[PDB]
Short mmCIF file of C-alpha atoms and ligand atoms in Angstrom, two decimals:
data_model
loop_
_atom_site.label_atom_id
_atom_site.label_comp_id
_atom_site.label_asym_id
_atom_site.label_seq_id
_atom_site.Cartn_x
_atom_site.Cartn_y
_atom_site.Cartn_z
CA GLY W 1 22.16 -4.77 -12.94
CA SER W 2 23.92 -7.97 -14.01
CA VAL W 3 22.11 -9.97 -16.80
CA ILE W 4 22.22 -13.77 -15.92
CA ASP W 5 22.11 -16.44 -18.58
CA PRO W 6 19.53 -19.45 -18.01
CA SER W 7 22.43 -21.90 -18.56
CA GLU W 8 23.93 -20.50 -15.23
CA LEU W 9 20.88 -21.32 -12.77
CA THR W 10 20.38 -24.71 -11.32
CA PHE W 11 16.91 -25.39 -9.92
CA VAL W 12 17.04 -27.35 -6.83
CA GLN W 13 13.76 -27.35 -5.20
CA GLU W 14 10.38 -25.44 -5.60
CA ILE W 15 9.70 -23.78 -2.37
CA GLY W 16 6.76 -21.28 -3.25
CA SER W 17 4.00 -20.71 -5.53
CA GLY W 18 2.51 -17.53 -5.51
CA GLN W 19 -0.12 -15.37 -7.41
CA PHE W 20 2.72 -13.67 -9.64
CA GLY W 21 4.98 -16.91 -9.83
CA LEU W 22 7.11 -19.49 -8.47
CA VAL W 23 10.10 -19.47 -6.08
CA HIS W 24 12.93 -22.10 -6.11
CA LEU W 25 15.87 -22.77 -4.21
CA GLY W 26 18.65 -22.77 -6.69
CA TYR W 27 22.27 -22.07 -7.53
CA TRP W 28 24.02 -19.54 -9.60
CA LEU W 29 27.08 -20.43 -11.25
CA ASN W 30 27.17 -23.78 -9.16
CA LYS W 31 28.23 -21.29 -6.26
CA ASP W 32 25.86 -18.82 -4.87
CA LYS W 33 22.64 -20.07 -3.22
CA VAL W 34 19.87 -18.21 -4.75
CA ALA W 35 16.04 -17.65 -4.66
CA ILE W 36 14.84 -17.88 -8.02
CA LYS W 37 11.41 -16.10 -8.83
CA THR W 38 9.69 -16.93 -11.93
CA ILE W 39 7.19 -14.85 -13.45
CA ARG W 40 3.61 -16.29 -13.93
CA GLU W 41 2.97 -16.10 -17.61
CA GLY W 42 -0.07 -13.77 -18.25
CA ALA W 43 -0.59 -12.73 -14.65
CA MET W 44 1.90 -9.97 -14.99
CA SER W 45 3.84 -8.19 -17.61
CA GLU W 46 7.49 -8.69 -18.14
CA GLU W 47 8.05 -5.09 -18.47
CA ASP W 48 6.68 -4.25 -14.90
CA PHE W 49 8.18 -7.65 -13.44
CA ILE W 50 11.58 -6.40 -14.80
CA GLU W 51 11.12 -2.79 -13.51
CA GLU W 52 10.55 -3.86 -9.94
CA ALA W 53 14.04 -5.57 -10.18
CA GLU W 54 15.59 -2.31 -11.40
CA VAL W 55 14.00 -0.38 -8.65
CA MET W 56 15.50 -2.91 -6.01
CA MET W 57 18.98 -3.13 -7.35
CA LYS W 58 19.67 0.54 -6.56
CA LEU W 59 17.97 0.51 -3.10
CA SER W 60 20.98 -0.66 -0.81
CA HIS W 61 20.38 -1.18 2.90
CA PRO W 62 21.08 -4.17 5.28
CA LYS W 63 17.48 -4.66 6.04
CA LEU W 64 16.34 -4.85 2.41
CA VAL W 65 16.85 -8.01 0.30
CA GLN W 66 19.16 -8.01 -2.50
CA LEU W 67 19.37 -9.36 -5.91
CA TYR W 68 22.23 -10.97 -7.99
CA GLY W 69 20.22 -10.18 -11.11
CA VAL W 70 17.83 -10.75 -13.74
CA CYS W 71 17.30 -13.63 -16.33
CA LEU W 72 15.42 -12.27 -19.32
CA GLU W 73 16.65 -14.60 -22.33
CA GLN W 74 14.38 -17.60 -21.70
CA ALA W 75 10.77 -17.15 -20.87
CA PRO W 76 9.44 -17.84 -18.12
CA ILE W 77 11.77 -15.00 -17.13
CA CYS W 78 13.01 -14.59 -13.67
CA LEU W 79 14.61 -12.65 -10.95
CA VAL W 80 17.52 -14.04 -9.10
CA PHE W 81 17.86 -13.04 -5.32
CA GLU W 82 20.05 -13.96 -2.64
CA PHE W 83 18.84 -16.96 -0.47
CA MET W 84 17.34 -16.03 2.94
CA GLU W 85 18.12 -19.01 5.16
CA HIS W 86 14.92 -19.18 7.10
CA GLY W 87 12.04 -18.02 4.73
CA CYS W 88 9.31 -15.83 5.38
CA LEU W 89 8.73 -14.07 8.71
CA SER W 90 5.03 -15.17 9.02
CA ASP W 91 5.80 -18.58 8.84
CA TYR W 92 9.10 -18.57 10.83
CA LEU W 93 7.12 -16.75 13.77
CA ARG W 94 4.60 -19.72 13.39
CA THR W 95 6.87 -22.42 13.37
CA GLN W 96 8.80 -21.10 16.58
CA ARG W 97 5.88 -20.13 18.53
CA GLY W 98 6.90 -20.22 22.15
CA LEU W 99 10.64 -19.83 21.62
CA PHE W 100 10.76 -16.01 21.45
CA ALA W 101 11.75 -13.70 24.14
CA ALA W 102 9.92 -10.25 23.85
CA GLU W 103 13.28 -8.73 23.07
CA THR W 104 13.65 -10.87 20.05
CA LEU W 105 10.32 -9.69 18.78
CA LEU W 106 10.95 -6.23 19.22
CA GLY W 107 14.21 -6.54 17.41
CA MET W 108 12.39 -8.07 14.43
CA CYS W 109 10.24 -4.90 14.27
CA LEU W 110 13.32 -2.69 14.55
CA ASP W 111 14.97 -4.67 11.48
CA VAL W 112 11.78 -3.86 9.38
CA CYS W 113 11.46 -0.38 10.65
CA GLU W 114 14.99 0.41 9.73
CA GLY W 115 14.40 -0.76 5.94
CA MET W 116 11.06 1.16 5.81
CA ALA W 117 12.67 4.01 7.21
CA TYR W 118 15.25 3.91 4.10
CA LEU W 119 12.44 3.29 1.58
CA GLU W 120 10.56 6.32 3.15
CA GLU W 121 13.53 8.71 2.78
CA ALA W 122 13.86 7.34 -0.89
CA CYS W 123 10.14 8.23 -1.42
CA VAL W 124 9.53 4.31 -1.91
CA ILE W 125 6.02 3.43 -1.11
CA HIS W 126 5.88 -0.44 -0.39
CA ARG W 127 1.91 -0.90 -0.66
CA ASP W 128 2.10 -4.45 0.46
CA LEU W 129 3.98 -4.56 3.75
CA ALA W 130 3.40 -7.84 5.86
CA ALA W 131 5.01 -10.43 7.69
CA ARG W 132 4.63 -12.60 4.58
CA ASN W 133 6.63 -10.29 2.50
CA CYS W 134 9.61 -10.19 5.06
CA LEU W 135 12.37 -12.62 5.10
CA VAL W 136 14.38 -14.30 7.70
CA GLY W 137 18.23 -14.53 7.44
CA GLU W 138 20.95 -15.87 10.10
CA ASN W 139 20.72 -14.79 13.64
CA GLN W 140 16.98 -13.87 12.88
CA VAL W 141 18.00 -10.65 10.76
CA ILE W 142 14.76 -9.58 9.12
CA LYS W 143 14.70 -8.16 5.65
CA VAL W 144 12.15 -6.37 3.69
CA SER W 145 11.18 -7.93 0.55
CA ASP W 146 9.01 -7.24 -2.52
CA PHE W 147 9.35 -3.46 -2.33
CA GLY W 148 9.91 -2.25 -5.71
CA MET W 149 6.12 -2.72 -6.91
CA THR W 150 4.42 0.25 -8.80
CA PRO W 167 -5.05 -7.87 1.15
CA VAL W 168 -7.56 -5.59 3.17
CA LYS W 169 -6.23 -6.68 6.64
CA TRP W 170 -2.90 -4.84 6.21
CA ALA W 171 -4.51 -1.81 4.37
CA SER W 172 -5.09 1.73 6.01
CA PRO W 173 -8.60 3.08 5.67
CA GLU W 174 -7.52 5.61 3.09
CA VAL W 175 -6.13 2.90 1.05
CA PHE W 176 -9.19 0.37 1.36
CA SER W 177 -11.51 3.34 0.53
CA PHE W 178 -9.67 5.56 -1.67
CA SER W 179 -6.25 3.75 -2.80
CA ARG W 180 -4.34 6.84 -1.22
CA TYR W 181 -0.98 5.11 -1.04
CA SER W 182 1.79 6.85 0.93
CA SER W 183 4.54 6.24 3.52
CA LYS W 184 1.71 6.77 6.10
CA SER W 185 -0.33 3.98 4.65
CA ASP W 186 2.94 1.84 4.83
CA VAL W 187 2.85 2.73 8.59
CA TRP W 188 -0.61 1.37 9.21
CA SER W 189 0.69 -1.84 7.70
CA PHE W 190 3.68 -1.70 9.84
CA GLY W 191 1.33 -1.64 12.85
CA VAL W 192 -0.40 -4.80 11.69
CA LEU W 193 3.12 -6.44 10.97
CA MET W 194 4.15 -5.73 14.58
CA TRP W 195 0.79 -7.24 15.80
CA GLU W 196 1.91 -10.48 13.57
CA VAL W 197 5.35 -10.33 15.28
CA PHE W 198 4.23 -9.86 18.82
CA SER W 199 1.19 -12.64 18.25
CA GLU W 200 3.94 -14.87 17.13
CA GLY W 201 2.29 -15.35 13.52
CA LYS W 202 -1.45 -15.18 14.33
CA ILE W 203 -3.29 -14.17 11.14
CA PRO W 204 -4.97 -10.66 11.65
CA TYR W 205 -8.78 -10.60 11.84
CA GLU W 206 -8.95 -14.07 11.42
CA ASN W 207 -12.04 -15.64 9.56
CA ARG W 208 -13.44 -12.09 9.05
CA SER W 209 -14.64 -11.04 5.55
CA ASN W 210 -13.17 -7.83 4.09
CA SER W 211 -16.65 -6.20 4.64
CA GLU W 212 -16.49 -7.11 8.37
CA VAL W 213 -12.93 -5.64 8.55
CA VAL W 214 -13.63 -2.59 6.86
CA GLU W 215 -16.81 -2.07 8.93
CA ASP W 216 -14.81 -3.05 12.44
CA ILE W 217 -11.80 -0.59 11.61
CA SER W 218 -14.47 2.16 10.51
CA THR W 219 -16.03 1.66 13.92
CA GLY W 220 -12.89 2.15 15.84
CA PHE W 221 -12.07 -1.54 16.45
CA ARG W 222 -8.33 -2.25 16.46
CA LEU W 223 -6.33 -5.72 16.89
CA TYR W 224 -6.38 -6.73 20.49
CA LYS W 225 -2.92 -6.59 22.34
CA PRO W 226 -0.88 -9.70 22.18
CA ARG W 227 0.28 -11.24 25.28
CA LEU W 228 3.79 -10.81 24.52
CA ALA W 229 3.34 -6.99 23.67
CA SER W 230 3.95 -4.72 26.68
CA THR W 231 1.95 -1.62 27.18
CA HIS W 232 4.11 0.58 25.54
CA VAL W 233 4.53 -1.65 22.44
CA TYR W 234 0.70 -1.53 22.14
CA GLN W 235 0.63 2.20 22.50
CA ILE W 236 3.15 2.33 19.35
CA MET W 237 0.90 -0.07 17.14
CA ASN W 238 -2.00 2.27 18.08
CA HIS W 239 -0.16 5.28 16.97
CA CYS W 240 0.20 3.40 13.54
CA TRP W 241 -3.48 2.76 13.53
CA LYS W 242 -4.55 6.31 13.78
CA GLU W 243 -7.49 7.08 11.35
CA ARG W 244 -5.81 10.05 9.71
CA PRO W 245 -2.32 9.36 8.01
CA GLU W 246 -1.11 12.95 9.27
CA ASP W 247 -1.51 11.79 12.97
CA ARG W 248 0.72 8.58 12.44
CA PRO W 249 4.45 8.68 12.83
CA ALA W 250 6.95 8.38 10.02
CA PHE W 251 9.04 5.41 10.17
CA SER W 252 12.21 7.47 11.08
CA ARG W 253 10.35 8.60 14.27
CA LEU W 254 9.04 5.05 14.91
CA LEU W 255 12.67 3.55 14.80
CA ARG W 256 13.73 5.78 17.59
CA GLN W 257 10.46 5.12 19.67
CA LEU W 258 11.06 1.33 19.37
CA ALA W 259 14.69 1.64 20.22
CA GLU W 260 13.64 3.62 23.27
CA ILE W 261 11.21 1.12 24.49
CA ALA W 262 14.08 -1.70 23.83
CA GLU W 263 15.94 -0.09 27.02
CA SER W 264 12.83 0.87 28.82
CA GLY W 265 9.24 -0.76 28.83
CA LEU W 266 8.93 -4.43 27.01
C1 G7K P 1 11.94 -11.64 -2.96
O1 G7K P 1 11.89 -13.08 -3.24
C2 G7K P 1 12.65 -13.89 -2.47
C3 G7K P 1 13.99 -13.47 -2.01
C4 G7K P 1 14.64 -14.23 -1.08
C5 G7K P 1 14.16 -15.28 -0.72
N1 G7K P 1 14.94 -16.12 0.22
C6 G7K P 1 13.95 -17.19 0.68
N2 G7K P 1 14.31 -18.30 1.34
C7 G7K P 1 13.41 -19.42 1.77
C8 G7K P 1 13.87 -20.12 2.64
C9 G7K P 1 12.84 -21.47 2.94
C10 G7K P 1 13.25 -22.43 3.90
F1 G7K P 1 13.11 -23.35 3.23
F2 G7K P 1 14.64 -22.60 3.99
C11 G7K P 1 12.68 -22.42 5.32
C12 G7K P 1 11.15 -22.72 5.14
C13 G7K P 1 10.46 -22.76 6.31
C14 G7K P 1 11.08 -22.42 7.43
F3 G7K P 1 10.32 -22.42 8.79
C15 G7K P 1 12.36 -22.21 7.66
C16 G7K P 1 13.09 -22.15 6.61
N3 G7K P 1 11.56 -21.20 2.66
C17 G7K P 1 11.38 -20.21 1.83
N4 G7K P 1 10.04 -20.13 1.41
C18 G7K P 1 9.46 -18.97 0.75
C19 G7K P 1 9.12 -17.78 1.32
C20 G7K P 1 8.62 -16.82 0.45
C21 G7K P 1 7.40 -17.24 -0.07
O2 G7K P 1 6.68 -16.34 -0.92
C22 G7K P 1 7.64 -18.41 -1.01
C23 G7K P 1 8.16 -19.66 -0.21
N5 G7K P 1 12.08 -19.18 1.34
S1 G7K P 1 12.57 -17.19 -0.21
C24 G7K P 1 12.82 -15.59 -1.15
N6 G7K P 1 12.09 -15.06 -1.72
#
């Protein structure tokens, strides 16, 4: 990827403050609107932070966020991404609650599923798929973000007990992301501790069917939440199941 000099960035407004660093609305070259992600000094190594960018810069799909480049010269170092006009999906769903047709919500799931099928094919495991790590562009296009990395509520049981990450553990997470979309940004397992969530899931409890989700939609969420990873569908199959409902039973 392209190396960006710090002098080429204009920081306009701080919009986010995470564990791994700050996010700012900015401009590159006084031209392109960008989301600038500054590393949090100490909280993560520059090597790892940079390697995430490298991974991302060679994964090209319409439903995966893109970078303009990396700014290494002046610490704190940063990644420079394209600016997604409507911010993160979890917040978007929350602020637009009541203004969504079920068809639109299904389309958002489809967008995320297309990007995840691409990642799955590339043998790239996300590890932290959640509405909070998806972004909203124009005409409500959803892109997957933060997908180049090396939250118990989105973790499959084999992940929360044994750290067995896989594309099928991403599918469990996608099921929870589907629940977030159809509940229009509710927090899954609200006010429950990790111990309680683990126990509930190990018991057979699953997130309740949201009002805007049809029976078929909920059947698909549940297939993502099967106990054994091998009983869950791959993203490339989920994509077509989700598309078939868009015609039939919403
Ligand atoms: C991978 O990092 C990236 C890449 C691109 C990108 N684009 C972004 N755009 C916006 C736009 C707006 C907005 F202001 F235009 C906006 C806000 C609310 C709303 F309802 C509608 C629009 N808010 C935000 N907020 C951030 C979301 C992600 C979070 O971790 C940090 C805050 N990002 S972030 C980003 N990160």
